[PDB]
Amino acid sequence: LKCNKLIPLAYKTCPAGKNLCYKMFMVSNKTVPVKRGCIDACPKNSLLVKYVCCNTDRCN
């Protein structure tokens, strides 16, 4: 699986153990991402930072 980078054009494969994609959003703008990468296990969402996982290509 591959996930997009911070800038919508670059991407990187999810490392050993990481076969899931995730995105870190901040209350400041839940409509725009703060961080993007891959993850091993789908994380827990927060009130301040919202985490969204996906099992698709260039999902995030």
UniProtKB/Swiss-Prot annotation:
Q: Which SUPFAM superfamilies match?
A: Snake toxin-like (SSF57302)
Q: How is this protein annotated for GO cellular component?
A: extracellular region; membrane; other organism cell membrane
Q: What is its main location?
A: secreted
Top-level taxonomy: Eukaryota, Metazoa, Chordata, Craniata, Vertebrata
Modified how: May be regulated by glycosylation.
Q: Name one GO biological process term.
A: killing of cells of another organism
Q: Which CDD domains does the protein's record reference?
A: TFP_snake_toxin
Tissue expression per record? Expressed by the venom gland.
What's the protein here called?
A: Cytotoxin 3
- In the UniProt record, which residues carry a glycan? N29
Mind listing the UniProt keywords for this protein, alphabetically?
Cardiotoxin, Cytolysis, Disulfide bond, Glycoprotein, Membrane, Secreted, Target cell membrane, Target membrane, Toxin
State one molecular function term (GO).
toxin activity
Give the record's subunit note.
Answer: Monomer, or heterodimer with alpha-cobratoxin (AC P01391); disulfide-linked.
The role this protein plays is: Heterodimer: has no cytolytic activity, but retains most of the alpha-cobratoxin capacity to compete with alpha-bungarotoxin for binding to Torpedo and alpha-7/CHRNA7 nicotinic acetylcholine receptors (nAChRs) as well as to Lymnea stagnalis acetylcholine-binding protein. Monomer: shows cytolytic activity. Exhibits concentration-dependent growth inhibitory effects in the lung cell lines A549 (IC(50)=1.22 ug/ml) and NL20 (IC(50)=2.76 ug/ml), in the prostate cell lines PC-3 (IC(50)=4.46 ug/ml) and RWPE-1 (IC(50)=0.65 ug/ml), and in the breast cell lines MCF-7 (IC(50)=12.23 ug/ml) and 184B5 (IC(50)=2.83 ug/ml), with high selectivity for the lung cancer cell line A549 (selectivity index=2.26). Induces primarily necrosis in the A549 cell line, and mainly late apoptosis in the MCF-7 and PC-3 cell lines.
Compartment(s): Secreted; Target cell membrane
Which cysteine pairs are covalently linked by disulfides here?
A: C3-C21, C14-C38, C42-C53, C54-C59
Stated family: Belongs to the three-finger toxin family. Short-chain subfamily. Type IA cytotoxin sub-subfamily.
Indicate whether Transferase appears among the record's keywords.
no
Q: Which Pfam families match?
A: Toxin_cobra-type (PF21947)
